[PDB]
Design a protein around this ligand. Structure first.
Ligand SMILES: [Mg+2]
Ligand SMILES: [Mg+2]
Ligand SMILES: [Mg+2]
Ligand SMILES: [Mg+2]
Ligand SMILES: [Mg+2]
Ligand SMILES: [Mg+2]
Ligand SMILES: [Mg+2]
Ligand SMILES: [Mg+2]
Ligand SMILES: [Mg+2]
Ligand SMILES: [Mg+2]
Ligand SMILES: [Mg+2]
Ligand SMILES: [Mg+2]
Ligand SMILES: [Mg+2]
Ligand SMILES: [Mg+2]
Ligand SMILES: [Mg+2]
Ligand SMILES: [Mg+2]
Ligand SMILES: [Mg+2]
Ligand SMILES: [Mg+2]
Ligand SMILES: [Mg+2]
Ligand SMILES: [Zn+2]
Ligand SMILES: [Zn+2]
Lengths: 100, 92, 73, 53, 56
RNA sequence: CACCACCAGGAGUGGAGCCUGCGGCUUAAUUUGACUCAACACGGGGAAACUCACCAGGUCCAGACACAAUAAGGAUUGACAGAUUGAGAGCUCUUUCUUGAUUUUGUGGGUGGUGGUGCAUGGCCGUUCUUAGUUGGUGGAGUGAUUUGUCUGCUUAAUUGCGAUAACGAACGAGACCUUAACCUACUAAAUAGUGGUGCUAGCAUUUGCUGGUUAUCCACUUCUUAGAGGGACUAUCGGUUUCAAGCCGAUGGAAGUUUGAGGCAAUAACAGGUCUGUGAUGCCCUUAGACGUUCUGGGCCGCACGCGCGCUACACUGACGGAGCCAGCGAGUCUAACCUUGGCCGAGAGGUCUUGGUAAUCUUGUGAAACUCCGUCGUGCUGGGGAUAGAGCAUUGUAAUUAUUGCUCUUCAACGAGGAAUUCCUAGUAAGCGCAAGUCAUCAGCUUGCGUUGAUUACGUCCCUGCCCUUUGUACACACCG
């Protein structure tokens, strides 16, 4: 059946227990699964000057944004696939399913 | 402002139906969305309506949020000659 | 700032707001007959024989369609 | 007349503006957010950008 | 079909825009922040104010 | 006390040619802000148009709303051709159609302004000062303002702490914290990461091997790659020296022993510091229809006798040119758009064209980067150093490239032979060399923010110079010596 859950949040601790609750609820339903592949975290960096005007000492400033992205691959008949994704949706954590 | 009578009735009838109107502050955009008239018309006409206590505005990152008042539902109704309590915003 | 001399040549020619003309709709008038029409109209797909034609020097207009309809006599 | 607002605005500093304050200078176009540099710095914390290092 | 970099930064600017709208007009009900929740079939936006009777 | 000071040094700058910013001069305009540190590659300010504020001209109203006036025997709007105009702005006029209460003319009253004032303000930022500084409670001294605590000394990056001790015990700042980089054959796992095998093959040998290719060969694996949870360093152990105390200095072990390295955050009290040109942040003043609004066309911001300040290329065999080898890390990238571009073909090139992959650990991409390395020609000659300044063509971006946008070819081939007085930065993966990505970006990097690559010499001090802090002291000062 080959469905795949992908998680792409920025909050790591929300993301993990989402991912843990996928894999643990899998194991009551006893499904074979590729355990979470953790892709390299990608840092979005924006380096701006502090001052609004152009006076003073040239102090710069780097704002960054870390994005964490995991995927879990599952094979399951339809009733578990309807059950797993319907629950365990946590705010700020993005979930999307692809099949095959 | 001098705009033909038909599109002021478009703006005024669309306002009645949605209770609200959103309008990007882009003059010369020349084509509103949700309405087939010029963007400058819907801004300026709703500027004429707010200056008579019928609609209130909020700028909020160049978008001009309009929601019409209790004065607005009575005036417009007189204007469109529609049946009483025919305003969508007013009745859930 | 330094000054404003308003240097440029004076060309204040704000226009005429289409001066109110006298009694109009002169189709023709006929003593005890049906009236024909001066200023030929237009065989258009919209205009329903209500719009007249300007009579210029060697051309006929439209007014509402701003397109010449002159044809050779 | 049609000649009003007729010059192209497809590229260059005249095509883009800050989505908050409609300014042309110091725009930040990385990652497609298009906010001026002084307005992003006021909005960076609630967008999700933070200072760590 | 937009990349994850842009998608997450878009939801940041979406929150930032929607916070400014709520703080500008809902000031007189004690607006103290907003939360957005993407969900299958719906997006839910929980307004946090003090005079909750006034916002309704 | 401190490489924004010196010491011992390194690499420079100041000389030269160009690039860029400021002043000056010039101009129709060469828009403007900022003049020690704490203005001058700064306003993310790499301006062809736009941006844009300046200059020469031309449109428009996008002058809400109210009250009057006008006025359905028309309040007002639009225009074909011609004159006009840079113009296919009917902008204005000749000419006469069309529209229909939306407008028009005044009175108010608004609105817009990158107009003024940052010495009227907010917020933010810079600076004092990222130095080590600041304050209560209770007790003691004093009539009191105040003082001690908060110190002679030693110590530390540090009012960091030991010690002395009318003071004890704390608070903020420092430190802790957080991020990041270094260790983990320990855990949890993975064709979007990678090995090893086994299939299928290629080449070479031939023994029982060597090196590759292969995506449906599949089975196992986690060392290397990635990130979750954790562990680990605490100057541990020993020696030496010091009220034998805080510490400091050697050696051993260790992945790591300068605060383990580097940052982020950062007190009280200030400053007429900068910003009204980031803001739909703003008071007041000005302006508001021959506008200081908005838009369009064309210039300007780039103009060059000169004076400065950040830089780039060099002055040469520790090198230039040619061929061959050949290795990173940080990162960015398109859909309702046309961004990163593989591969094939054409072209000397720059480029063109046909397909493809990629919304991304999947594709560009092992980003095959440059310095460098190995072989060769040069042979101390302003020379094959240097490539400024000029002339012709071919392309690319773009509505447009002339005061050459940028790229390519050929030719022309200047100063400069290590730079006076002056002066800057720096203590280990650091200085310096060398490139690449990102930001701005339709095009344009000699700039900045980062990242790797190659990698030294010298010191492990001091108050001599320059700054800042403290103590004692004098004072007729206290908007505080610019008294
Ligand atoms: Mg400055
Ligand atoms: Mg020089
Ligand atoms: Mg500048
Ligand atoms: Mg400048
Ligand atoms: Mg102007
Ligand atoms: Mg204005
Ligand atoms: Mg202006
Ligand atoms: Mg001020
Ligand atoms: Mg006391
Ligand atoms: Mg007493
Ligand atoms: Mg006391
Ligand atoms: Mg010793
Ligand atoms: Mg040469
Ligand atoms: Mg690269
Ligand atoms: Mg020449
Ligand atoms: Mg000296
Ligand atoms: Mg260098
Ligand atoms: Mg004396
Ligand atoms: Mg005195
Ligand atoms: Zn017609
Ligand atoms: Zn802005």
């Amino acid at each position: 059946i080959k469905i795949r859950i992908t998680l792409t949040s920025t909050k790591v601790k929300q993301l993990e227990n989402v991912s843990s609750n996928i894999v643990k609820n899998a194991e009551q339903h006893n499904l074979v699964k590729k355990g979470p592949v953790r892709l390299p975290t990608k840092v979005l960096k924006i380096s701006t000057r502090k001052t609004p005007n152009g006076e003073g000492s040239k102090t710069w400033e780097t704002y960054e944004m870390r994005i964490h992205k995991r995927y879990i691959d599952l094979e399951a008949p339809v009733q578990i696939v309807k059950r797993i994704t319907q629950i365990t949706i946590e705010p700020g954590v993005d979930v999307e399913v692809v099949v095959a | 402002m001098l705009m033909p009578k038909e599109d002021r009735n478009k703006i005024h009838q669309y306002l009645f139906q949605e209770g609200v109107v959103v309008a990007k502050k882009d003059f010369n955009q020349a084509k509103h969305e949700e309405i087939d008239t010029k963007n400058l018309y819907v801004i300026k006409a709703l500027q004429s309506l707010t200056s008579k206590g019928y609609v209130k505005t909020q700028f909020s990152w160049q978008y001009y949020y309009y929601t019409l008042t209790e004065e607005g539902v009575e005036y417009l109704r007189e204007y469109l000659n529609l049946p009483e309590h025919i305003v969508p915003g007013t009745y859930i | 700032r330094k000054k404003k001399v308003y240097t440029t040549p004076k060309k204040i020619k704000h226009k005429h707001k289409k001066v109110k003309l006298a009694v109009l709709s002169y189709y023709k008038v006929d003593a005890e007959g049906k009236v024909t029409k001066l200023r030929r109209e237009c065989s258009n797909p919209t205009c329903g024989a209500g719009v007249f034609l300007a009579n210029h020097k060697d051309r006929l207009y439209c007014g509402k369609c701003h397109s010449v309809y002159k044809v050779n006599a | 007349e049609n000649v009003w607002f007729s010059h192209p605005r497809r590229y260059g500093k005249g095509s883009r503006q800050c989505r908050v304050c409609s300014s042309h200078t110091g725009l930040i176009r990385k990652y497609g957010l298009n906010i001026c540099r002084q307005c992003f710095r006021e909005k960076a914390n609630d967008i999700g950008f933070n200072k760590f290092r | 079909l937009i990349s994850k970099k842009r998608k997450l930064v878009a939801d940041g600017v979406f929150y930032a825009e929607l916070n400014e709208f709520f703080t500008r007009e809902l000031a007189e009900e004690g607006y103290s922040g907003v939360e957005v929740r993407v969900t299958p079939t719906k997006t839910e936006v929980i307004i946090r104010a003090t005079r909750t009777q006034d916002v309704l």
